[PDB]
Design a protein around this ligand. Structure first.
Ligand SMILES: CC(C)(COP(=O)(O)OP(=O)(O)OC[C@H]1O[C@@H](n2cnc3c(N)ncnc32)[C@H](O)[C@@H]1OP(=O)(O)O)[C@@H](O)C(=O)NCCC(=O)NCCS
Ligand SMILES: CC(C)(COP(=O)(O)OP(=O)(O)OC[C@H]1O[C@@H](n2cnc3c(N)ncnc32)[C@H](O)[C@@H]1OP(=O)(O)O)[C@@H](O)C(=O)NCCC(=O)NCCS
Ligand SMILES: CC(C)(COP(=O)(O)OP(=O)(O)OC[C@H]1O[C@@H](n2cnc3c(N)ncnc32)[C@H](O)[C@@H]1OP(=O)(O)O)[C@@H](O)C(=O)NCCC(=O)NCCS
Ligand SMILES: CC(C)(COP(=O)(O)OP(=O)(O)OC[C@H]1O[C@@H](n2cnc3c(N)ncnc32)[C@H](O)[C@@H]1OP(=O)(O)O)[C@@H](O)C(=O)NCCC(=O)NCCS
Ligand SMILES: CC(C)(COP(=O)(O)OP(=O)(O)OC[C@H]1O[C@@H](n2cnc3c(N)ncnc32)[C@H](O)[C@@H]1OP(=O)(O)O)[C@@H](O)C(=O)NCCC(=O)NCCS
Ligand SMILES: CC(C)(COP(=O)(O)OP(=O)(O)OC[C@H]1O[C@@H](n2cnc3c(N)ncnc32)[C@H](O)[C@@H]1OP(=O)(O)O)[C@@H](O)C(=O)NCCC(=O)NCCS
Ligand SMILES: Cc1cn([C@H]2C[C@H](O)[C@@H](COP(=O)(O)OP(=O)(O)O)O2)c(=O)[nH]c1=O
Ligand SMILES: Cc1c[nH]c(=O)[nH]c1=O
Ligand SMILES: [Mg+2]
Ligand SMILES: [Mg+2]
Ligand SMILES: [Mg+2]
Lengths: 294, 283, 286, 290, 285, 285
């Protein structure tokens, strides 16, 4: 259905796709099946829109922009493609992502699967999968769909939460933990992360083999743990709190305070090969492992 | 006047409302009289819009938006998906309104603001996220000092500095015009927070910021003024039926309040329009 | 080409200018040659647009907006007319670009060749060459802009020198020293100190006809733009042994001051309000 | 008993006083009964020493120094009588003790039953019952001196400690107290004390009629309460803890922190003749009422 | 030699001890040999003073004060009264003041004018009012440095500084010579506190101050040295049988300790002289 | 007058010296005229004491201590020998029960406070107190209210500079040969000085100087060989001119303090006069 108030010059528009009034569509555009292209928006030539995409009003999809399947583009969303524009002189929005109203997406930017860009955000950097990004400049503030006793279990597979023995007196303070009793392994390595800008997002990975144990020894940080299907986020803000990450648990650490030091104990020596850094690969290697194990 | 170039499907548009070129207005929408609906804008089906409303270009008014009389919607305002924009409010160019939001009578949304929570009557809200930074149409040199707002007075207290320390003193029924029955203290208030937003029916109140600073809006239903309480020798008297707000607390601010009455949750008035009526009713 | 699907009442459109679908241009509008006015955008009566101007989609140029030659106006940029809505003039000066979905407040001047960031909210004038970003928008740099590693080093900005002073450190506390004529190349008649500057503030924005300056950041840090008309560069003054020499006729800006920063300036001449060139065009011509 | 190895020239030494070896006592000195003047100590002419005084070795009691009864002066304590000497009276009151190798500046008064810690340099009058240590000496407590419940009596007569209703959340914090219900009177006055240096001792008085209620609204300070027989010290360290001082309670507020702001409710208008500033006087008064 | 001008009533005074003018020595007193007790000092009845002691002028040794051998007690030092013991080889600086019932450790150095209100450990240097330990008698650039102190190692860990923050890394059995069974952390220590003051019979320890700073004394019984731990990339290894002290903590300081064994109260040695002897012992094979 | 109850062995005591009881004075000592050595004091062999010295009781003057004319030594003052030669210079006075570490110079007319522990040289006219002793002032030492004011100290002036404060910041400014009465050839800056440091302690033969504390606080002593005063420089708009031949000291620096100094001549080592007695003599020409 191409409304007669629309100016559509392209022939590669799939079945069930509606283009409404006052839409301009140039000839090189490729739009999939079952899309809705709402009034008063524009789509240039060097563009590919996948299937079931909603593009609400006041949007412009410029040359170099690819919108994969199931993406929602909110009203008055704005894209760009030149970082330094001067008169007379590629961005990808991944499957399922949702871009909120009157957002502004800078050029050459990746928005990840199922991500949620918040109304009005100014997206200056790649958005990871599932991330929720808000503000000017946009910062990751949450993930889509994401203590006071010795050992509690998370909702995420095998992730356990710990409280360590803490003593307070006049001479000072002490907390202690035992490997194999408290923390469920014996490390071969520890490292520390500190001096981390409050905007930064650390981790975004999983380990095939290495077990990890995390303790924020001053200030605070937030830790996201993800098992491929469940996801949960914890504030670590005292030296006597700790989180166990089994191997094949995807982890993020972010929202570090200015004073924050993260101490990590690790079951194995350092190994660049032991990292999975793509969430979709992770999600798939985890099912393989879950299907073999059960 | 429905432009040849508009696509207006709704019958229910009132007298002397102009709709300009390339507007789309769906069948359900109801629209009052004397509205100006500028070029390249959209109005969906359950939308009701009062009289004398200005919608500038690039605005999309979705289902579940309600706009009362005398509202100005500036260019490129974005709404989303019940939102209500109350009488005489004006929403600044290219702002973004989150869903389920109420914008109060006479508020002023600044240009580009990302509005994430209800905006009280007469509030000026700016930023991403939007924060109240002032009120529309909104010192302490002397012992006593009367405010333009009915019955509100300002006090500078006796202050002694020396080598041993500092002291300030005030006396009840003398520098402060009543004998209190309660005191309370508010502190650790986040800077983004807005406190109070009520009036008292019977309770007199006296306000001193004993460290840090906070700002105090007092409002008598017609006049409103905003004051900075930034030293312990400064105080503000609120007579009963004075609407008060306090906000922009610094991180270490402690507000001390003395009150004529013991706590009584039924003594509050939390709706500004209600409070407005009750004042017009007394005078 | 005025596209058949536009609606243009203006008779003062320059040659080779294109106006695309669903644009509205009212009768009073004056638009130059070689402009490109893209779909879904509007222009009102009291507007002058120069030549070689690009205006992308979803933009409205309201009454009182004047846009000069070679300006790029990005998609969904929004201009405004009145401060307190329920007659002020904006001018986007030559060569400026205004980034997508920025919002420009009433009565603002946008300097030549400025770069307004995408999404910015611009609530005060933008100088020539500035880059402005954020809500509210803040100057974060200048278009076309480590060291203090040697004692003396010349900038590309004409006459401008960068200096590293003798520094003594021991357990009794630290000393740095500088000598007039010798290390700093004039004898001062005045010194002044700039301090307690908010972090959003831009200072200077001028050049001097006769007055020579030597800047030293004596606690904390600030940034110094020096501009000779052609070239410009930004330096960070973050240490008491680092100094910069500004000859006369050097446009200067100090901004990005830290909370505790104190700038110390040595001058060759007594204070003289007549010696200031505030006007960036006026400056470039000379 | 005056040792043969002593050189004692005063005929004014009361009975059962012993003067040990290598002491020097000049003709003018007056010394009471039952004293012990230990070896290697010196006493000059214009000196009155009371009864039952112990003066350990290596002390000199200079012209202008009055030691009253029951005082204990530890070994190697040093007194002075000239404030800027180039080649003023001190009084040590009844029952006070001066710790070993302390140094007392000229013109100084040491109150009854005070305790000067060993090694301290005492540059300012020491009040009755005070414990003073350090160089420079600071009062860090008083001799013989938990805010859990809403209401709680003190050892000190009539003194109450109060825990006030607190509310903590995301919006901020609030505490509230009501007069004649939480605080046992209705104020006519309030005053605030702030910017007190950490060495200052404030108060040191009792009121004849004024009730007072103390809340430390920011930071911390310490409050000594004294009823003439019992005394206790409390730490005021949060806005929700207060302390009631009935009339005729001796009060001191000291050890203020930098940020400390003390708030006081008062039952009466400011009145300078309501003060009692002498501890002995106050004590007799708080005995003559009982 | 008992000077004519002293009043000495004790015959229990060892050979070659000199007692000079204007001293008073009561009869209960015992004084070892070869001492020097200078003019205008006084000694009471329950007092035992060992051999080769020097007591300078203006000093009173009261009842309940024992002084061991080779002590030096400077001029105008003052003791008070409970039992005080000044241990072999200690030296008490001029015009110091010792409170009652105090232990002064062997070879401790009490600074002139100090006011000593707390036991002084062996080898400590103590000064001020109140007296504080500021050092010990006779007390990080490479990946690994060996201490003078037997078996002690200093470690510099891999450090990465960049845009996104900072990272320091350690590996057990490569950087740190053991695998731990326990970590502990110590924080919010007042700047005046002295921590540790023990050796372990078996437990290995590795110390990294993770923020702020503290100082760490290591002592193998003959040799000792103090080091400053002021960044997360510096580490110190303590083999078993190393006497350790952690002090001068900053308000911010967090010490992280890795230990080879589980927590065993019976693995502590808290008496330095016991520790020193046990150590001379093992050197004997 | 040697008291019968004293033990004096030295032959070399000058006329009208009194030695009182229970004093011990060894054979090698030399003491000048008109001294008072109070009871229960001790003086060793290599000691020289000038004229008109008072030594109050409880003091011992050990070998290696020289005390010059007009010195006042208070009761119970203690000196020491072993951590050299102590010199207490003319007119100085040592307060009651102070303690003086070995090898120390006490400057002329200094005033050591009662109970102080003097661990470092004390400059002429310094008042020193505490443990450890710190200089807290100088003997006989609403400023900056007016644009310009003159000090009792010769030719010293106090400046308040033009100060602008508004929304955009603050700015303070001063012009050479107008507010500041000379034209600079050099500037230098002093910072990160520990609060216990005393800096300067010299005069210049030729160099004029001008001081502004552009951040923090700083105290400055100025001294013209006869009058002296101390000023606090605690905002960027206060300034102090030191004409040539002005002894100046700066001390009591706060942690953030930065001292800016304008000098009329280029740096020249030889223009310093670092001895105060030498400055006072030069100053009477
Ligand atoms: C991003 C979003 C999902 C967050 O919602 P939420 O997680 O429920 O957050 P809350 O409403 O509880 O607010 C929590 C905080 O985030 C802030 N916030 C929420 N959304 C924000 C936004 N878009 N930009 C800036 N800040 C925002 C709130 O102000 C609050 O912070 P504060 O307490 O410091 O003021 C949602 O607000 C949003 O932006 N949705 C997209 C709307 C849209 O485009 N709809 C199209 C329909 S046609
Ligand atoms: C909100 C508004 C009323 C406030 O104006 P004002 O009271 O005059 O405030 P000022 O212009 O004095 O500026 C005061 C401060 O707030 C900032 N400010 C003002 N409007 C702002 C906005 N919309 N967003 C962010 N900051 C804003 C200014 O930058 C300045 O702060 P700074 O000093 O830290 O940068 C007005 O600026 C506004 O946004 N009006 C809407 C205009 C409009 O949309 N018109 C449509 C008609 S065509
Ligand atoms: C302003 C601009 C020129 C700066 O780009 P740049 O110098 O290459 O800057 P970077 O991308 O390296 O970003 C540097 C910092 O500024 C921030 N930033 C950059 N552009 C921003 C913007 N528009 N708003 C807010 N922050 C921005 C980044 O987030 C980063 O800050 P952070 O580290 O705190 O997050 C560019 O970002 C821009 O906005 N260009 C115009 C694009 C446009 O509107 N085109 C329309 C025509 S197609
Ligand atoms: C003043 C005195 C009574 C305090 O004793 P107390 O109440 O038991 O004090 P504590 O030992 O519990 O010490 C608590 C604090 O005070 C300090 N302190 C105690 N006495 C001190 C003194 N005289 N000088 C300086 N500091 C002292 C302690 O070191 C400790 O502080 P810290 O924790 O920072 O180190 C006692 O210390 C004293 O000085 N007595 C004099 C004895 C004397 O001289 N006798 C002569 C008879 S022979
Ligand atoms: C304790 C002692 C061993 C330390 O000496 P040192 O290591 O040489 O110390 P330095 O001389 O290098 O001084 C270093 C610091 O400690 C201080 N200090 C030294 N001795 C001190 C004392 N007794 N009390 C207080 N502070 C002292 C110094 O003032 C300096 O600190 P600062 O830089 O803040 O001023 C020594 O100073 C001492 O007190 N010796 C005793 C002398 C004695 O009594 N002899 C009797 C023989 S007759
Ligand atoms: C050093 C001295 C000359 C200072 O006198 P002053 O300037 O009148 O000093 P003030 O009494 O006005 O006191 C000022 C400050 O210094 C302190 N102070 C004074 N003398 C001190 C001393 N000897 N040690 C430590 N602190 C001292 C005071 O406590 C006060 O400090 P605060 O406010 O923090 O408590 C004098 O106090 C002194 O010690 N005189 C020697 C007396 C003596 O021994 N005489 C022997 C002959 S009998
Ligand atoms: C003042 C000055 C010092 N210096 C160096 C050499 C000096 O010895 C040193 C200053 O040390 P010094 O004069 O000894 O310290 P103070 O004056 O605080 O007692 O720094 C210069 O190189 N140039 C200068 O202009
Ligand atoms: C979504 C949509 C529905 N109906 C319209 O007429 N236009 C639109 O854009
Ligand atoms: Mg927009
Ligand atoms: Mg003595
Ligand atoms: Mg002494």
């Amino acid at each position: 259905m191409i409304h007669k108030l629309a100016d559509v010059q392209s022939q590669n528009i799939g079945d069930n796709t509606k283009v409404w009034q006052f839409c301009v569509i140039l000839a090189g555009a490729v739009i999939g099946r079952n899309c809705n292209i709402c009034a008063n928006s524009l789509i240039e030539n060097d563009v590919v829109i996948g299937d079931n995409v909603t593009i609400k009003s006041g949007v412009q999809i410029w040359d170099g922009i690819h919108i994969q399947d199931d993406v929602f583009i909110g009203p008055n969303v704005t894209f760009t493609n030149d970082k330094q524009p001067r008169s007379k002189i590629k961005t990808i929005v991944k499957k399922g992502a949702s871009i909120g109203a009157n957002s502004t997406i800078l050029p050459g930017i990746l928005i990840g699967e199922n991500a949620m860009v918040g109304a009005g955000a100014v997206i200056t950097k790649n958005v990871p999968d599932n991330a929720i990004v808000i503000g000017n400049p946009g910062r990751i503030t949450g993930y889509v769909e994401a203590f006071e006793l010795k050992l509690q279990m998370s909702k995420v597979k095998g992730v356990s939460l710990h409280k360590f023995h803490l003593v307070n007196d006049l001479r000072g303070n002490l907390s202690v933990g035992e490997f194999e009793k408290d923390i469920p392994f014996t490390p071969k390595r520890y490292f520390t992360v500190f001096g981390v800008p409050n905007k930064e997002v650390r981790g975004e990975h999983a380990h095939k083999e290495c077990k990890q144990f995390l303790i924020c020894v001053s200030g605070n940080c937030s830790v996201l743990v993800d098992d491929g299907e469940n996801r949960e986020e914890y504030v670590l803000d005292s030296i006597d709190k700790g989180i166990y990450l089994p191997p094949m648990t995807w982890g993020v650490q972010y929202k570090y305070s200015k004073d924050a030091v993260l101490l990590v104990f690790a079951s194995h020596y350092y190994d660049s090969d032991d990292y999975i850094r793509d969430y979709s690969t992770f999600k798939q290697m985890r099912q393989n492992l879950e299907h073999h194990h059960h």
